[PDB]
Amino acid sequence: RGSHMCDAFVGTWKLVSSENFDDYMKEVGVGFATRKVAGMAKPNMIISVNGDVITIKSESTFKNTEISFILGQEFDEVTADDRKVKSTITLDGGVLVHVQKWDGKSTTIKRKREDDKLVVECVMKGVTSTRVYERA
Numbered sequence: 440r441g442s443h444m445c446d447a448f449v450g451t452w453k454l455v456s457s458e459n460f461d462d463y464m465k466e467v468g469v470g471f472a473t474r475k476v477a478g479m480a481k482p483n484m485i486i487s488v489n490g491d492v493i494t495i496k497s498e499s500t501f502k503n504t505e506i507s508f509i510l511g512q513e514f515d516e517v518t519a520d521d522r523k524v525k526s527t528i529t530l531d532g533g534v535l536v537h538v539q540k541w542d543g544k545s546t547t548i549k550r551k552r553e554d555d556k557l558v559v560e561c562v563m564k565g566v567t568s569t570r571v572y573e574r575a
């Protein structure tokens with residue numbers, strides 16, 4: 440295959456800043472101990488594309504996770520904080536939009552390229568967290 444617009448996400452990324460993530464996790468329903476340990480994590484994210492399949496891997500001292508998916512096609516995800524969710528990821532004008540649904544709740548995670556950074560915006564109801572990754 441030739442290039443895909445999704446190739447702009449491809450690579451190895453490291454978390455350099457996090458804002459409001461504790462309050463985001465609170466809104467999501469994450470328990471005290473998990474929030475404290477998860478909040479300390481400075482994960483590496485490795486994104487790759489192979490045909491129609493996109494893979495996002497996260498490695499940290501908190502948890503190692505991996506999801507593989509096709510855009511617009513719902514899949515089962517066990518999140519880092521051990522929620523069992525139904526996830527659908529789509530592209531909207533260059534932005535990967537990831538919706539997680541569980542227990543009648545919903546949260547949206549947007550991943551976008553901004554300058555040389557990968558910016559992750561997590562929203563749960565009225566609460567937004569911004570996490571910024573740089574190339575590793």
Ligand SMILES: O=C(O)CCCCNS(=O)(=O)c1ccc(Br)c2ccccc12
Pocket residue numbers: 454464467469477478480482484497501518519520548559561570
């Ligand atoms: O990848 C990031 O740095 C942003 C976090 C994405 C949030 N959704 S998640 O289920 O993949 C997730 C990923 C990583 C951590 Br640490 C989480 C902690 C609490 C709740 C969710 C967490």
